[PDB]
Each structure stands twice: as C-alpha cells, then as structure tokens.
C-alpha cells in the first residue's frame, strides 16, 4: 500500500510568514520550500535539475532561516538583553586618557565534539607608558628591564602571556607582571650606582 | 526519599512533550548539556581544580628540602622553570614531578657522597 | 656588556620567571623537557589509531542482532559456504600435518 502526498507547496499561503516555516537551520527539505529552484550544470538539450532529489541543493548551506524579515524579528527581541554604550567615550583620545590598558583576548570556535583549543590560553596586554607615573630614572630602568617588548616609536609596552593553562590565570599573571614591573622599576639598588 | 523521585517523575510526565520546534530542541539539549554553552569559550567545563597563576608559576616553595648552595639547586631551578612554563600539566602533576626527584635523590645517597660534593 | 647590563639581565629573568643564573645551551635542554608536553603524551600521538576492535566488534554484533547488514561479511560467508560444499574447507587444528 503505497501513498504519495503532494508537498506543502499547494498549501503555502501567499502572505505566510517564513520565519514560522524555517526558524532554525534546516537541510532544505524540498517539500517545505515552495520556491522552484534549479541547481546543477545543464544538459545540451536539457535544463538544470529541479529541487526534487537534488544533491547539490542539499550540499550547500541554506540561509532561509536568516531572511531579512526573520533577522529583523530576531534582533528586535534581543534589544532587551543589550546595554547602551556610553557616549562619553566616542573618540579614542579620551578612551586612552580614561582606560589606557588594552587586553587582547582570543576566542575560538570549531565544529566537532571538542572545545579545548591551545591557542585560547594566549593573552596580550598593551599599556602606553605615557599614561603612567614613571619618572626619568624609573622610565630608563623600565625600558632596559622590559627589552624588546616596548616599542620606542609608538611608546607601547606589550606583555604576552602563555605560561598559564587558563585564560584567567594568564590574565591575572599578566596584571601581576605589570604590577611587579612598575614596583621594581622604582627601586634603586646598590649595583645601579656603578 | 523514593517518593520524592516518584512525585518528580509524575510531574515530568506532564512537563515533557515531543518537540514542536527546533528552538525548543536546542533549549532542551542545552539544559541537558549536549549543545555548547554560547557564547563559546574554550575553557568551559575545565576549572583546573580552581588553581591560580601562583600555583603554576611559583614552585619555589617545594624546593625547601634540598641543599640550597649545591648543584641540586642549579638543576631544580631549571626543572622548576621548565614546569612553570608548562600549560599542559596540572599543579598536582608538577608536585609529583618534584617529589619524584625528591625521593630519587634521598634514595641514592652513596653516589652523591662519592661524587665529592657534600649533599643532603 | 657591562656589570650594570648583566645585573639588569639577571633581574629581568628573575622577574619574568626565566632562568636567572647563567646556564649552558646543553643545560637548557632539561628546561625544554618540562617546558612542553613530551611526544608520547600528545593526543596526536597516543590517540593516533581509533579502536578498530570496538568498530569491528560493534558492527559484527549489530549484524548478528539484525540491525546492521554487512555485505562484505555476507559475501565472505557465501563464498566459504560454497567452498565447504564443494569440499575444500578449513581443517581442524592438529590434524592438517600428521593426518
């Protein structure tokens, strides 16, 4: 007892909302898409293959769930979760005066069962030496204390931490190194007099 | 109490339902744990026993029972520096690494005294 | 190279967590042995081969319970049955040589 059903194309409404049809990622089932679309290399006397039984149409990623109307409807519902950016920091010049420390953090995503990526542990710290309270002696000591991690032309000190397994451990290690560098650039020891 | 579990399963019998939407499918599987924690960070589910940077970088506190002025300190400082730059191992593994050298040196006592250097 | 410079370099290594006192390049090898994970402990090395025993046993068991169908194993079984019917089968262990 075989039974063949006409697809949803004959029942699709002209003004039906498409986010209701394709809310999330789908394998592009041809019975749910009333759009007659032909994908494939044509034959000399033939035409490109229709949507039924077409493997090329299934291979490609479908963005039917990301139509502009659906994107509008989704983004409107997300406005309640976001917070407003302060207008007092529109230009970088005041951002450098108020928050001079920059923390470069890397986040990664990959398809598979695994999450752990060894490149995620690296944390970068960038601080401008023109926004600190170093004097001449402590500055000239700090330059030689850091070495090549300070850019003389741009006047930025970079601290790249990898030694800690976790991102938070790398971060608090980096702030500890910044504090220790600041404190040790101030102490004048016996051997500095020679 | 098994009766609490029976009441909970009687509640879950009417709470649960075959899925009506892909969004609900992902919500249920996220509550179960199958779907990833979005936004995806590479350190989810791994706390490393709640350790901090001072437990990984500073291992000098484990070198107290060794000769301070001998070549054992010269070798253990390189071992400690190597272990402190190692993000692939947890703190307990480094503790065991130090303890291995500890017991090896405390076991082989005749060779250190025969080598001509006074070691403990 | 000066006394001031070598003191600065010694302080820099102590502050950054590097090797403080002078050591030879051949001696930095033991620093390196612990600075990274050894070859035998890397997942790319000790997890190289998937468990073919699990794969083969699982597929055989589902074939026996009738949920997976192994066409290659069916072909082998049919060929062996034809071989045993024609009369050249697998001899018993211990009688091939002497008997």
């Amino acid at each position: 007892r075989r039974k063949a059903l006409p697809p949803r194309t004959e029942k699709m409404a002209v003004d039906q909302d498409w986010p209701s049809v394709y809310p999330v990622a789908a394998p592009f089932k041809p019975s749910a898409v009333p759009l007659p679309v032909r994908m494939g290399y044509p034959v000399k006397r033939g035409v490109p293959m229709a949507k039924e039984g077409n493997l090329e149409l299934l291979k490609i990623p479908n963005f039917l769930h990301l139509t502009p109307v659906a994107i509008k409807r989704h983004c409107e519902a997300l406005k309640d979760f976001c917070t407003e950016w302060p207008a007092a920091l529109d230009s970088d010049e005041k951002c450098e005066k108020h928050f001079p420390i920059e923390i470069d953090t890397a986040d990664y995503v990959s398809a598979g069962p695994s999450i752990r990526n060894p490149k995620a542990r690296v944390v970068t710290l960038r601080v401008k030496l023109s926004s600190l309270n170093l004097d001449d002696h402590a500055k000239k000591k700090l330059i030689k204390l850091v070495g090549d991690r300070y850019c003389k032309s741009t006047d930025v000190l970079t601290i790249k931490t990898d030694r800690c397994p976790l991102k938070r451990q790398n971060y608090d290690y980096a702030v500890y190194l910044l504090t220790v560098l600041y404190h040790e650039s101030w102490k004048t020891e016996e051997w500095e007099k020679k | 109490s098994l009766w609490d579990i029976e009441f909970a399963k009687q509640l879950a019998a009417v709470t649960e339902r075959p899925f009506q939407n892909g969004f609900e499918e992902m919500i249920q599987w996220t509550k179960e744990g199958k779907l990833w924690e979005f936004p995806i960070n590479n350190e989810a589910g791994f706390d490393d026993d709640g350790s901090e940077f001072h437990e990984h970088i500073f291992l000098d506190k484990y070198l107290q029972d060794f000769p301070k002025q001998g070549p054992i300190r010269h070798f253990m400082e390189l071992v400690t520096c190597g272990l402190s730059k190692n993000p692939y191992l947890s703190v307990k593994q480094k503790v065991e690494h130090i303890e291995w050298f500890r017991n090896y040196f405390n076991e082989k006592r005749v060779i250190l005294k025969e080598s001509g250097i006074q070691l403990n | 190279l000066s006394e001031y410079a070598v003191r600065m370099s010694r302080l820099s290594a102590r502050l950054f967590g590097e090797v403080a006192r002078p050591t030879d390049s051949k001696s930095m090898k033991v620093v390196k042995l612990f600075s990274e994970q050894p070859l035998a402990k890397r997942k790319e090395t000790y997890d190289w081969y998937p468990n073919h025993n699990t794969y083969f046993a699982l597929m055989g068991t589902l074939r026996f319970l009738g949920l997976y169908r192994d066409e290659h194993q069916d072909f082998r079984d049919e060929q062996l049955r034809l071989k045993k019917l024609r009369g050249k089968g697998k001899p018993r262990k211990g009688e091939g040589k002497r008997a």
Binding site: Y176, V180, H183, W191 | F53, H54, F58 | L11, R14, R21
Partner: peptide, 18 residues
C-alpha cells in the same frame, strides 16, 4: 660570580602571588 638577593616572598605577599 656574585649573586644578587631577590625578595620573592615579599613581592608575592605585596602583589597577591603567594
């Protein structure tokens, strides 16, 4: 030759790395 004494415990206690 000469070795300089570095206060590691004091720095760790001061800046929270003990």
């Amino acid at each position: 030759a000469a070795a300089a004494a570095a206060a590691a415990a004091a720095a760790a206690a001061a800046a929270a790395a003990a």
